Write a protein that binds this ligand. Structure first.
Ligand SMILES: CCN1C(=O)[C@@H](NC(=O)c2cccc(C)c2)[C@@H](c2ccc(F)cc2)c2c(C)nn([C@@H]3CC=CCC3)c21
Length: 373
């Protein structure tokens, strides 16, 4: 088949796909991009349709099988290589980019393609002076000029690697990035399972970040890393997370923590974090979340947000598993409920647990109403 990766075995192992895997990241399951559009692989837009089934239909046509929205790394490379061929055709039609592209060696061509993926042809074509320097093989001067640009300020770590590629004509910046992340992962990995960081490694990670391991900030990091389960941090989770956060060091990750915290000020992002917590805390082998574990995580994530959290604790402690829908709807209850619960709609199809809670809260509510200020 024309797309077979065996047709590229004459190339080096480092290539444009592996470059963008480092600079942008790779997703093997359909996800929504910044604009809400279904995407997979390295930034491959599937459709603007709101229908996941439509996105799956487009993916199946492009891959050649029924994927149910999940592909392999090799399949993602085939999709990406088609996108590269299209980007190169565009470069070759562009009077502002063709001369420099033609003049460049293969490694530096990859750096230019990287730029086009990030900012489009129009954006790259704006770099008139730097492109002329590249065409003249004035590598150090091009590197200096590119570093003065807004591009550098927008994505400093990616831009530094692309600039180093123009400066040297080698893959050194990508070899160095990979080694840094490998050596950092090796500081944390479980000595008995190289595929994960265990509890001791998570503790070392927290210590290196100057985080109380009991801070909600730890769970915020797990959310940003899309961690599947508490007490484990898989190698893929660590590498994908450091990539998506643009960090190759603990110092850089430490600087990102306040930005992750700030994201939660949006109710939509807090809801995402709140819903993530359920699947993260649940035992993989169980369908629901044990009540005691639910209470612990509820107290971490809802303290200061749910005005009836203390009453909720008392209600549950006098109770005898929590499904996902009950977990999710507690946040909606917290958002709508009046300070005295007077606006609760019993016909609203809330979980029985919440119906019972509203009834249980009646003595406390009444007592407060008869208490002097
Ligand atoms: C504070 C809530 N938390 C967690 O967020 C856990 N994090 C994870 O595993 C983890 C997984 C992947 C990636 C990252 C960054 C974290 C885990 C834990 C915390 C600190 C620690 F160094 C080791 C483990 C844990 C434990 C054992 N308990 N919980 C408590 C649960 C409920 C309330 C308070 C804390 C925590």
């Amino acid at each position: 088949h024309s797309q077979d990766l065996e047709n590229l075995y004459f190339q080096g192992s480092m290539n444009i796909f592996e470059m963008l895997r480092i600079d942008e990241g790779l997703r093997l399951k359909i996800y929504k991009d910044t604009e809400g559009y279904y995407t997979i692989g390295i930034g491959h837009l599937l459709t603007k349709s709101p229908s996941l089934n439509a996105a799956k239909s487009e993916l199946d046509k492009a891959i050649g099988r029924n994927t149910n929205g999940v592909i392999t790394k090799d399949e993602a490379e085939k999709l990406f290589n088609q996108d590269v061929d299209a980007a190169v055709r565009g470069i070759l039609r562009n009077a502002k980019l063709k001369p420099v592209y033609d003049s460049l060696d293969a490694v530096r061509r990859a750096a230019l393609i990287n730029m086009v993926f990030q900012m489009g042809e129009t954006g790259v074509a704006g770099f008139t002076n730097s492109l002329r320097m590249l065409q003249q093989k004035r590598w150090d001067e091009a590197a200096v000029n590119l570093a003065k640009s807004r591009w550098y300020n927008q994505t400093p770590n990616r831009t530094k690697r692309v600039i180093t590629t123009f400066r040297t004509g080698t893959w050194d910046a990508y070899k160095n990035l990979r080694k840094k992340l490998e050596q950092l992962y090796n500081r944390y990995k479980d000595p008995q399972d190289e595929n994960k960081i265990g509890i001791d490694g998570i503790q070392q990670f927290c210590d290196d970040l100057a985080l109380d391991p009991a801070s909600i900030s730890v769970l915020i990091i797990a959310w940003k890393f899309r961690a599947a389960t508490q007490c484990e941090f898989s190698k893929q989770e660590f590498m994908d997370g450091m990539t998506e956060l643009g960090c190759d060091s603990i110092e850089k990750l430490k600087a990102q923590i306040p930005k992750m915290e700030q994201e939660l000020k949006e109710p939509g992002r807090f809801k995402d974090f709140y819903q993530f917590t359920f699947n993260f805390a649940k035992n993989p082998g169980q369908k629901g979340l044990d009540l005691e574990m639910a209470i612990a995580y509820w107290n971490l994530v809802l303290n200061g947000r749910f005005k009836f959290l203390d009453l909720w604790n008392k209600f549950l402690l006098e109770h005898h598993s929590i499904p996902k829908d009950t977990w999710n709807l507690l946040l909606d209850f917290s958002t709508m409920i009046a300070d005295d619960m007077s606006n609760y709609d019993e016909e609203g199809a809330w979980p029985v647990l919440i119906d019972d809670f509203v009834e249980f809260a009646r003595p406390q509510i009444a007592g407060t109403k008869s208490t002097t200020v």
